[PDB]
Ligand binder design. Structure first.
Ligand SMILES: CCCCCCCCCCC(CCCCCCCCCC)(CO[C@H]1O[C@@H](CO)[C@H](O[C@@H]2O[C@@H](CO)[C@H](O)[C@@H](O)[C@@H]2O)[C@@H](O)[C@@H]1O)CO[C@H]1O[C@@H](CO)[C@H](O[C@@H]2O[C@@H](CO)[C@H](O)[C@@H](O)[C@@H]2O)[C@@H](O)[C@H]1O
Ligand SMILES: CC(C)CCC[C@@H](C)[C@H]1CC[C@H]2[C@@H]3CC=C4C[C@@H](OC(=O)CCC(=O)O)CC[C@]4(C)[C@H]3CC[C@]12C
Ligand SMILES: CC(C)CCC[C@@H](C)[C@H]1CC[C@H]2[C@@H]3CC=C4C[C@@H](OC(=O)CCC(=O)O)CC[C@]4(C)[C@H]3CC[C@]12C
Ligand SMILES: CC(C)CCC[C@@H](C)[C@H]1CC[C@H]2[C@@H]3CC=C4C[C@@H](OC(=O)CCC(=O)O)CC[C@]4(C)[C@H]3CC[C@]12C
Ligand SMILES: *SC[C@@H]1NC(=O)c2csc(n2)[C@H](C)NC(=O)c2csc(n2)[C@H](C)NC(=O)c2csc1n2
Ligand SMILES: Nc1ncnc2c1ncn2[C@@H]1O[C@H](COP(=O)(O)OP(=O)(O)OP(=O)(O)O)[C@@H](O)[C@H]1O
Ligand SMILES: Nc1ncnc2c1ncn2[C@@H]1O[C@H](COP(=O)(O)OP(=O)(O)OP(=O)(O)O)[C@@H](O)[C@H]1O
Ligand SMILES: [Mg+2]
Ligand SMILES: [Mg+2]
Length: 1177
């Protein structure tokens, strides 16, 4: 799969690439042609003149005239060099700008198509794969592609042109010697190819490891409340660290192989030098060639050899890009069997729903050996209501998922109006179906936008009508900003009942002819449930509905009732018929200033491996100084080779130069490898340390930090990955080349000051000018860098919001809306990339142009000095070479400066997140750890305000008391603050008024880890992790290796053990992301077991039996009653029996305690609890 990286290159894109390639060819061949112009004559020296006093030459007047002639020749050469500099100015800008624009367009289209491909997959594909990596891909791999299809290919083609044009000039002049060097060239090609293949494979593995780490981080951050409650920060940090170690090892291998490749290239270049000199000597004694011929060949070929040796980093970048582009285009090329974006299907104009399920056999793709439905049969007529009843894991949610065709059945047929649903358009099929899931999931936006996700072209009046139909109007009206209130991830900033009612309204605005309600009133209370049922009954004739529920009134009111038993339906009829059939339904009803200093600050964290720094520095000075030193050595060797005054063997003896060239090649190989490897290893270790430290700091943060809309899970993951990537991009094998260039400039200055003088004053003139160019570029790029970061975060958020909630997006047919949102988010980075392309291309063109222009100015000034006889003609060439190398060094440093600007802000953000301290420090060892606690919980006038909505009073100073062995039942309406009490007792937030005492001690004076370890909580929405069942249960009691036997007994205590035993792989069965690959009852029971394995002193239950059977509820209640005394228990529920069985009951009216006492005490008085118990009875 090669050249797939350019799959999305259009006509304009290909034109940009072609013109950039042509400009690269011209720019590359400019140099060998310029040296051949010097080779137009034999000696490259217009006249020996005074330097040769071989003949008497006693002319004091004619020497002045021939000096004037030399000045004229130098002036003509300077004019030619100025023209070549202008041409270079044009061509370098053209090539870099065109290639960078091409890369930007391809990256934009690749991101768009990758997101489209991700949104185009099936539910089963999302179940099989760890989709948590995908976002990291969108952030990381595409970027690795961007630095491999940009300016790097332009530079590679330029150096290829230099090399091959020099070789063509060689075939023109000295074909035999040129063929001898082109015989060595294949070794360079083979080495480059092999090392590029190895580097691409290593990059693929490293990016896989980074994607694994990103998936781990995304899962941990999405469930940060569970991690904080159970104190799992260390374990998640270790899980991140394992993938960090793998990525670090792969990066070290990548650096090793890249530096081997570069050093081998340089060694081969020097070996080509040595062999060319040998063969030229051999031919120049045999009289086959003249001295001018072999010098011409040398000057034509060897500089291009150096050019390819310098080019090899672009090959490294292209190999990294190819390694990155593997999984992206593997996912892009995947074709789902159920295509939601296909336009080929039937679209019936009139559909009176006739849901038929004919001998349906189904098994989930992730767990395919287990059978769920075995010949399911159902016939639902138009406008009727069917109530699906059974036990947990029976397959009711499976039937709901099959109705909307999230999966296809292996056997059987699902049809509507006698038409099989596989022949109907998938988008049209899911558009006529409105579904409310077992535990709904919203999106991190306003309430109005969440409602509009059901149907986009919806007016505000009918939104209001649907919200009234869902009994949600009152609390939205009480909310400031109305329906523009922002809700957290998955509706985390709304209560369970409010979130469920918002989901109901979202389903209702769809105006569905097929309604699916999978426990739509699980989190509702009596009044809201009653009014919602009345509202649904008002408009029940128009549509056909399927309902799964726990309350008996809604099951009785259904037109027909179906009962699940072992994958089939065993009872199907009216309520009276099933009542008189004494079946399963019978026993169910019976049972009742962005500082620049930040760079150095981050590099100070890299001080542990300082020997790598010093070794790399030494090697960088060695090679950077060797380059101008080799410029002098080559000139001296050429001069000695020309002066063959002793005739032949003296010159065979000059083979010592091939020795010296081989020695220099060995030294260059060793030093280049050593410098690159040391810097790359230190930088990769720094990258690991930054990832680890930033993730640890993120885990240290408070719940309010994650409640901030800007600290979204996708935003957090994108921030982490991108900040680390930028700092790595400025701290890899690149700082080495800045040190090498500094050494190059220093050595050039030294050699120009030794051999000559008054010409280095020109070098001190060029160093400012070129630098100032990069300077402004740097500033400008920094001016946009921050913006880009922000935009990327936003884009990342959208992508994660689409991936973490993919089932909801598929059910809502909102994939196109999220694609449009992703494109709108990516809009700003696109224009930023185009502008940066233009600016950096201008910078490169300016650097090369001033290189050439200052070289011409050096010609002019040196000619003036020679005419004045202030400084000899022989040494001007070495000073000119030093000027050229210094200009190249400064230009390369200025080219680096953009990356320094881009990573300065990332380093600042990294330092900011590291040094941030939360208000409630979960990592602090300071605090009070009582030796033994009695478990007495007391809220004393606690007033709490949520930081995201600070004005709204949630708790207005309610008093609460519960003792050891007591059970406290918190009752109230939705939004009253029952879960707020649980979240406050976990020290998620600190109340501003009032205080919570645990055995008389304020919870702010205790160690937060110790306090959290004393409490076991079951949340309103249980959340598991994408790992094994046993690992999920053992996650309850961290800081201790939980044994298998106690996991088994905790599962037994939660009535989930039998289901685990029935599963293949038993307790090693992997659960999906957030528990999505489990039944709601099974997931809730596993959460209960996770809480119970702790054996906590303070048990907190928040609707812990929201989705359980009568059998499961009875078993769990008996298990809790076994251990009532000896632990304090607080329970939030709307079931009458659970509340009336508790020791004490507290009623919370809009945040205040209103009634407190036993069940009989509250029943005897005529209050709201009496009203509830009377309504239920
Ligand atoms: C180290 C720092 C150096 C300085 C840093 C920044 C330098 C920015 C210069 C880069 C530069 C010229 C590059 C030529 C260089 C020559 C060789 C270089 C030799 C180097 C020694 C990009 O080139 C522009 O040229 C345009 C045509 O000339 C092209 O327009 C496209 O062509 C087709 C494409 O598909 C299509 O038809 C179509 O898409 C376009 O028509 C584009 O190619 C591009 O926009 C100009 O950039 C900037 O120029 C200024 C004009 O003042 C513009 O200001 C704005 O213009 C209004 C627009 O709305 C605004 O309203 C106004 O608010 C503001 O005034 C900017 O917009 C921007 O363009
Ligand atoms: C070694 C490194 C540093 C440089 C490698 C050179 C590439 C940048 C050049 C070589 C050949 C060029 C390609 C020649 C032909 C094509 C196929 C063309 O797409 C197709 O026709 C493929 C089928 C499809 O449309 O899906 C897109 C441009 C592309 C990849 C060109 C893009 C630029 C390529 C890959
Ligand atoms: C010394 C002069 C002659 C220049 C040296 C480079 C060239 C000889 C060119 C011609 C063929 C080119 C190669 C042709 C194809 C590839 C594979 C391409 O993809 C891979 O890295 C393969 C990875 C994999 O298959 O897993 C990357 C660029 C590379 C090595 C090219 C690198 C540059 C090469 C060696
Ligand atoms: C005129 C001069 C420059 C010599 C002309 C020949 C070279 C340009 C050719 C001859 C043999 C070629 C090599 C033959 C085979 C390979 C292995 C190849 O490896 C892969 O990409 C393998 C990928 C896979 O197997 O999946 C990379 C290019 C390379 C080094 C080639 C690079 C270009 C070479 C040196
Ligand atoms: S300065 C960058 C580039 N030159 C080299 O890479 C290089 C390696 S070795 C070498 N030059 C020897 C010392 N060159 C000569 O002896 C020589 C004779 S004539 C000449 N160089 C002309 C003046 N050089 C250039 O035009 C030139 C531009 S860039 C460049 N060399
Ligand atoms: N995405 C999935 N991948 C694999 N197995 C799954 C998936 N979803 C559910 N299961 C399993 O398939 C079986 C059927 O569960 P299902 O969700 O259909 O039950 P249910 O009737 O909706 O139950 P509940 O009353 O608890 O909501 C269970 O064993 C469950 O763990
Ligand atoms: N993270 C949050 N940020 C802001 N407001 C919140 C947050 N969580 C809950 N709220 C709001 O606080 C109020 C009560 O929330 P809470 O979850 O404590 O209620 P509850 O009594 O447990 O409700 P329910 O019975 O519906 O689960 C509601 O107005 C709710 O929208
Ligand atoms: Mg279910
Ligand atoms: Mg709640």
């Amino acid at each position: 799969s090669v050249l797939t990286m350019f799959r999305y290159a259009g006509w304009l894109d290909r034109l940009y690439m072609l013109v950039g390639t042509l400009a690269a060819i011209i720019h590359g061949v400019a140099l060998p042609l310029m040296m051949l112009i010097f080779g137009d004559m034999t000696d490259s020296f217009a006249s020996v003149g005074q330097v040769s006093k071989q003949s008497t030459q006693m002319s004091e007047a004619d020497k002045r005239a021939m000096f004037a002639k030399l000045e004229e020749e130098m002036t003509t050469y300077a004019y030619y060099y100025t023209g070549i500099g202008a041409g270079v100015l044009i061509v370098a800008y053209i090539q870099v700008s065109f290639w960078a624009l091409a890369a930007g367009r391809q990256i934009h289209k690749i991101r768009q198509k990758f997101f489209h491909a991700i949104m185009n997959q099936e539910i089963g594909w999302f179940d099989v794969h760890d989709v948590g990596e995908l976002n990291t891909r969108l952030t990381d791999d595409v970027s690795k592609i961007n630095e491999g299809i940009g300016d790097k290919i332009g530079m590679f083609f330029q150096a290829m042109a230099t090399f091959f044009g020099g070789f063509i000039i060689g075939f023109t002049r000295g074909w035999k010697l040129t063929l001898v060097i082109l015989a060595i060239s294949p070794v360079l090609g083979l080495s480059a190819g092999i090392w590029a293949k190895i580097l691409s494979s290593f990059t693929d593995k490293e990016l896989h490891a980074y994607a694994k780490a990103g998936a781990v981080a995304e899962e941990v951050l999405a469930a940060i409340r569970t991690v904080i409650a159970f104190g799992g920060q260390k374990k998640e940090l270790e899980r991140y660290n394992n993938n960090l170690e793998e990525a670090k090892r792969l990066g070290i291998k990548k650096a090793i192989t890249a530096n081997i490749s570069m050093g081998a290239a340089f060694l081969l270049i020097y070996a080509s030098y040595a062999l060319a000199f040998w063969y030229g000597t051999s031919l120049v004694i045999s009289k086959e060639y003249s001295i001018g011929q072999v010098l011409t060949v040398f000057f034509s070929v060897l500089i291009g050899a150096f050019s390819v040796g310098q080019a090899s980093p672009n090959i490294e970048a292209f190999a990294n890009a190819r390694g990155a582009a593997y999984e992206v285009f593997k996912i892009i090329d995947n074709k789902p069997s159920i295509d939601s974006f296909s336009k080929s299907g039937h679209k019936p104009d009139n559909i009176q729903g006739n849901l038929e399920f004919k001998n349906i056999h189904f098994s989930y793709p992730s767990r395919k050996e287990v059978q769920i439905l075995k010949g399911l049969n159902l016939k639902v007529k138009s406008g009727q209501t069917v109530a699906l009843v059974g036990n947990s894991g029976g397959g009711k949610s499976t039937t709901v998922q099959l109705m909307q065709r999230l999966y296809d059945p292996l056997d059987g047929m699902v049809s509507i109006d006698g038409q099989d649903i596989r022949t109907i358009n998938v988008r049209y099929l899911r558009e006529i179906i409105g579904v409310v899931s077992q535990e709904p999931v919203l999106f991190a936006t306003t309430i109005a936008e969440n409602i509009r996700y059901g149907r986009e072209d919806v007016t505000m009046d009918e939104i209001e009508k649907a919200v009234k139909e869902a009994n949600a109007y009152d609390f939205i009206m009480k909310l400031p900003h109305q329906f523009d209130t922002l809700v957290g991830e998955r509706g985390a900033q709304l209560s369970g009942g409010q979130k469920q009612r918002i989901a109901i309204a979202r389903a209702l605005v769809r105006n569905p002819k097929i309604l699916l309600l999978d426990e739509a009133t699980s989190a509702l209370d009596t009044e809201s449930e009653a009014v919602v049922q009345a509202a649904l009954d008002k408009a029940r004739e128009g549509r056909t509905t399927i309902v799964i529920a726990h309350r008996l009134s809604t099951v009785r009111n259904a037109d027909v009732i179906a009962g699940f038993d072992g994958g089939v339906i065993v009872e199907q009829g009216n309520h009276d018929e099933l009542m008189r059939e004494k079946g399963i339904y019978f026993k169910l009803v019976m049972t009742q200033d962005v500082p620049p200093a930040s760079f150095w600050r981050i590099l100070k964290l890299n001080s542990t491996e300082w020997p790598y720094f010093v070794v790399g520095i030494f090697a960088a000075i060695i090679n950077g100084g060797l380059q101008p030193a080799f410029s002098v050595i080559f000139s001296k060797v050429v001069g000695v080779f020309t002066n063959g005054g002793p005739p032949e063997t003296q010159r065979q003896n000059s083979n010592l130069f091939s020795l010296l060239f081989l020695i220099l090649g060995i030294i260059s190989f060793i030093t280049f490898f050593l410098q690159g490897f040391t810097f790359g290893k230190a930088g990769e270790i720094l990258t690991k340390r930054l990832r680890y430290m930033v993730f640890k700091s993120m885990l240290r943060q408070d719940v309010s930090w994650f409640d901030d809309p800007k600290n979204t899970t996708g935003a957090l993951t994108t921030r982490l990955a991108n900040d680390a990537a930028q700092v790595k991009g400025a701290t890899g094998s690149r700082l080495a080349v800045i040190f090498q260039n500094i050494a190059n400039l220093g050595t050039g200055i030294i050699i120009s000051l030794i051999y000559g003088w008054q010409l280095t004053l020109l070098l001190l003139a060029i160093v400012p000018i070129i630098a100032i160019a990069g300077v402004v570029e740097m500033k400008m790029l920094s001016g946009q860098a921050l913006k880009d970061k922000k935009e990327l975060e936003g884009s990342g958020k959208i992508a994660t919001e689409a991936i973490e909630n993919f089932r909801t997006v598929v059910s809502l047919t909102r994939e196109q809306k999220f694609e449009t949102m992703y494109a709108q988010s990516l809009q700003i980075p696109y224009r930023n990339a185009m502008k940066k392309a233009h600016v950096f291309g201008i910078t490169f063109s300016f650097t090369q142009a001033m290189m050439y222009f200052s070289y011409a100015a050096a010609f002019r000034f040196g000619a003036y000095l020679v005419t004045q006889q202030l400084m000899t003609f022989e040494n001007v060439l070495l000073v000119f070479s030093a000027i050229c190398f210094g200009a190249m060094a400064v230009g390369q440093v200025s080219s680096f400066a953009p990356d320094y600007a881009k990573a300065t802000v990332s380093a600042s953000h990294i330092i900011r997140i590291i040094e941030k301290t939360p208000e409630i420090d979960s990592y602090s060892t300071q605090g009070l750890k009582p030796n033994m606690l009695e478990g007495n919980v007391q809220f004393s006038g606690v007033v709490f305000n949520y930081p995201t909505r600070p004005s709204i009073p949630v708790l207005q100073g309610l008093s609460l008391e519960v003792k050891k062995g007591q059970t406290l039942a918190l009752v109230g309406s939705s939004g009253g603050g029952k879960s707020t009490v649980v979240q406050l007792l976990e020290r998620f937030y600190d109340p501003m008024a009032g205080s919570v005492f645990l055995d008389g001690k304020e919870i702010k004076q205790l160690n937060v880890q110790w306090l959290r370890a004393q409490l076991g909580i079951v949340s309103q929405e249980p959340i598991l992790f994408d790992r094994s069942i046993a690992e999920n249960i053992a996650y309850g009691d961290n800081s201790r290796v939980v044994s298998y036997e106690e996991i088994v007994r905790a599962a037994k205590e939660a009535n989930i053990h039998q289901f685990i035993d029935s599963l293949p792989d038993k307790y090693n069965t992997r659960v999906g992301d957030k528990g999505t690959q489990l039944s709601g009852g099974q997931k809730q029971r596993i959460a209960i077991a996770r809480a119970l394995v702790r054996q906590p002193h303070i048990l907190l239950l928040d609707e812990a039996t929201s989705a359980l059977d009568t059998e499961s509820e009875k078993v769990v209640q008996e298990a809790l009653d076994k251990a009532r005394e000896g632990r304090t228990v607080i329970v939030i529920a709307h079931r009458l029996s659970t509340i009336q069985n508790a020791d004490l009951i507290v009623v919370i009216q809009n945040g205040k305690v209103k009634e407190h006492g036993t069940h009989q005490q509250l029943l005897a008085q005529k209050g709201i609890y009496f009203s509830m118990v009377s309504v239920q009875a």
